Every structure is written in C-alpha cells, then in structure tokens.
Design a binder for this molecule. Structure first.
Ligand SMILES: CN1CC(CC(C)(C)O)=Nc2c1nc(N)[nH]c2=O
Ligand SMILES: CN1CC(CC(C)(C)O)=Nc2c1nc(N)[nH]c2=O
Lengths: 270, 270
C-alpha cells in the first residue's frame, strides 16, 4: 500500500509496509589491550546480536566509535571483525554506523548491508559514492554544527534535502534513501520534543523515515530519570513515531520496543 | 486551553489540561472467611493505594466485584470499609466502580468522589439520579449486550449519546460527564483495535474521555502474550490514546504508565 518497493539489502529484503522494522543497537565494548578482533569482544557482540535477533530485531546496527580514542585505521580494525562474525553468525541485515567513506567501504566489503550516516553525507560526501557503488541503502540523518534554527522543522527538511542532493548527485537511487530527523543532534531538549511532535512533516519528502530516540537525554530531561530508567520514556517516543509514520526505530531495548511496535502496528492498521 | 473548567471532586480538583490523569486500579482481593471490612483485606487495599499514590496515580478506582459471588448487600459491605480506609489514609479522589444505584450511593456516603459506570447509566438509570444528587463526576462507559454493529464508531457514539441523555435528563451537569469507549466490552478483538484507531471521533461529543485498556485480552490477541506479559502492549494503547486526546487512563501498572503518559504529554504539548 504505502511503499511500492522493498528495501533490497543484498541477501535480505525488508518490506516497508508489513510492520515497523526494529534496528537493534549492537553494544560494542572494546578490549582495552587490543587493536580489534579479539575473542572476548567479538564473542560479546555476536552473543548480543543473537539475543537481539531472538528478541525481534530486523537489523543490527554496528559502530566503530560510541571507550578508547581511535584513528580511521583503528576504527576499521574494530568494526571489520565484528561485521564478519555477526554476518556469518546472525541472519539479519547489518548497518554500519559511520560518517567516514573508507570505514563505510571496508564495512560493506566485510559484510555490512546498509550505511548509517549521522552526518547525512555532509562530513564526508564521498560516502555517498561508496553507497552509490555498492548499491546499498544509506540513512541520512539530520545533523549540523549549530542550533541556530530560524524555524526548526523547515530547517530540518531543508538540511535533509541538502543531504539527499549529495546522495543523488553521487548516483544514489531514491530507493536506497532512508531519512532520519537526528533526534538528540544539534537540538535543545525543547527542539527534540518539537521534532517529535512534528515528525509527520518528514513524510512529504517521500522517503522512509528511521527514528532513533532510545534512552536519549531529552527523555531524561522530561522524566528526570537517568539512562537506565528510560524504557517507558523511549517507549512513548517509539509509539508517537510509529503513529507519525516511521518505518524503522533504532533502539537498545529490543524485546520491549518490538512488543510496543507490534501493538502500535496492529492499532494504526500497518 | 482545551477545557474551560476543572473536574470538581469535593475536596480535590483535577485540571484536565495540565497532564494525563492516571486512574490506578485498586486490587481488591476479598477475605475468604469474611463479610467485608476485615483487617487483612482492608490493609492490603490501603497499602496498594499508597503504593499507587506514590507511583503517580491521580485517582484510585475501587470495585465491589472483579473471587466469591456477592449480593448488592454483600457488595456494599466489601466496598464501603475500603473506601473509608483509603479516603482517610490516601489523599486522592476515589472512583467507585459500580453500575448499581444503591452501591453508588453508599460508596459516596462512605467517601467516594466519582462514579465509574461500566453500563453507562443503562443497567440502572437511577444511578444517574445518584450522580445528580451528590453532584459527583460520573464516567459513562460504552457497553451493550451484543456485538451487532452496523458501524462500530457511529454506533458507539450513538450509544454513548443515549447514556448522556439519561445522565442529563436526571439532572447531571455537563461538567460531571466523562465518557469512555469501553474497550474490551461488547467488542471483538478487531473492533477493539478499530476503536483505538478511531478514538479521536469521541472528542466531537465535547466531554473528557477516559480510556481503559490495561492488560486486556485484545493486547494478548495481538501480542500472543498472557496477562502478566502485557505491559508494553498496554503502554502502546496508553500512548495512542493520549495522542488521540484522552484526558484519563485507567491502568494497573501505575509507575510505568505515569512515565509513558508524562513523556507523551511533553511531546504532544499538553
Ligand atoms: C549512530 N547513531 C548514534 C545515536 C546516539 C546514541 C549514541 C545515544 O544512540 N543516535 C542515532 C544514530 N544513528 C541514527 N541513524 N539515528 C540516531 O538517532
Ligand atoms: C470498571 N472497569 C473494569 C474493566 C475491565 C478489567 C476487569 C479488565 O479492568 N475495564 C474498565 C472499567 N471501567 C472503566 N471506566 N473503563 C474500563 O475500560
């Protein structure tokens, strides 16, 4: 009905109309005495991806940087072994959480299916050329180095559009474009609540929307509850986001949010 | 802004615009060897009402019947001691969950502030005369002895309206009228999801709306999860309901739903 195509992720396909797709956030704790690839840290990633697969995750999101400061070179050595292990061992598409072109390239060559850019191709535009060449889905998230909005939503849609132009000029197909309001980036707590309240506006751009609100500090600001007490707050934002038409949510609490998403879907008629 | 009055509950007042008001469901386990008023069962009610007061409840809902079969006379002897204890010991308005006129009368004379009728004044119309005389708020819930809908929402609004006419003919003031779509009553699981999806229609009638979905079996039907596993499902329905404009939610999990309601409120701008 609403999407006339599926997200093609190489060996896996995501239907955009069936259900809200849960992206599970891989927790990625490095080893303190290693250069990446070590058995403790790879095995904890795989076990965690398996747990999230079993809890209802549709996508595993994997990042090079969320303890120790790393170079691009060191970010590659962490993330590449984990992508190879998770993709061998867990049958779910993987997104590689990076804004760097070379990191994105290796992550796909190592098995990643979707690029997840927090800089919307703006930090490193060549990443869109990476997405264009491998023919992968790429998430362009709203971000900026300031909070000088004239009008938050208007500006956010303008900024997303500048990202889409970079992606398309680089030969990215419309079907590989997912957008994200980048909640928690370049935004006051009041702007975050404003974006949530007005999220349906993003639908005019014609692309699927991913929302990432999980455990973020605007929830803490409303509830006055620390990061480990943010499950109900996150739930509310997942529910509002599915009701405003988002196709994906990016969450830590996969069991719980799958359940809320499934109920939300049944009620709104998706 | 949306309500130009507050709910007057005798000594307590509820602002309809500030926040979603949480009604907490008193669990009411009778003593098996007693005629009501016993210390084990009164003390467990008070302790539970105190716990819910502390978790964010705005209203305590108290029912005469939810183990052993009771007469009207026996329903009065259970509920009246608990209302006296809870109202002495917990500073929150109490709603008396009954459809019977005489039960409602004693419950108010014993300290209850709001009448909560699952039969919308239809089982015992004289209850509206009770509400009219004591000048209490009365909740008229959608119910019927069949599921022969021509058109669910149209019919539900027609039926609510027949309840409002009984309440008003009896001298109930518009400001003491709260409505409820009676989710889980006279409705298939698919009709329940249909009512949830179309809940905002109830707003045309001009009264505040209370939603009661907590742990109900339509959640179980969607999620295939038993009553103790319905917290995330309930959460979704509370979130959708606040987003569709409900003023009250009636819940068992008061801590959790207060948190979701508070986050929902911050996002929608209530
Ligand atoms: C890659 N990230 C990181 C992030 C922040 C924390 C660290 C709080 O999870 N948020 C997001 C993200 N990626 C996308 N696409 N959307 C997010 O909201
Ligand atoms: C008084 N009740 C009982 C009830 C069912 C269970 C037993 C599942 O909680 N639901 C409701 C109720 N009262 C109101 N106003 N609204 C309800 O949804």
């Amino acid at each position: 009905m609403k999407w006339d195509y599926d997200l093609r992720c190489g060996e896996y396909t995501l239907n955009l109309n069936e259900k809200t797709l849960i992206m599970g956030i891989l927790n990625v704790t490095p080893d303190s005495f290693s250069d990446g690839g070590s058995y403790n840290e790879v095995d904890a990633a795989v076990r965690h991806a398996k747990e999230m697969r079993d809890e209802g995750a549709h996508i595993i999101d994997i990042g090079g940087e969320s303890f120790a400061k790393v170079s691009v070179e060191e970010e590659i050595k962490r993330v590449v072994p984990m992508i190879q292990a998770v993709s061998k061992e867990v049958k779910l598409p993987i997104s590689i959480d990076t804004y760097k072109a070379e990191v994105a390239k290796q992550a796909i060559e190592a098995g990643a299916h979707i690029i997840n850019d927090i800089w919307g191709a703006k930090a490193e535009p060549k990443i869109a050329e990476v997405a264009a060449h491998y023919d992968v889905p790429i998430i362009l998230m709203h971000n900026r180095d300031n909070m000088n909005y004239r009008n938050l939503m208007a500006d956010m849609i303008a900024d997303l559009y500048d990202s889409i132009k970079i992606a398309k000029d680089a030969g990215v197909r419309d079907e590989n474009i997912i957008l994200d309001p980048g909640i928690g980036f370049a935004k006051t707590p009041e702007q975050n609540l404003e974006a949530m309240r007005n999220l349906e506006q993003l639908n005019v751009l014609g692309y699927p929307v991913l929302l990432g609100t999980s455990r973020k500090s605007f929830i803490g600001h409303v509830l006055d509850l620390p990061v480990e007490e943010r499950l109900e707050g996150t739930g509310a934002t997942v529910c509002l986001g599915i009701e405003k038409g988002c196709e994906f949510v990016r969450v830590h609490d996969v069991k719980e949010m799958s359940r809320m998403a499934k109920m939300m879907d049944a009620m709104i008629g998706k």
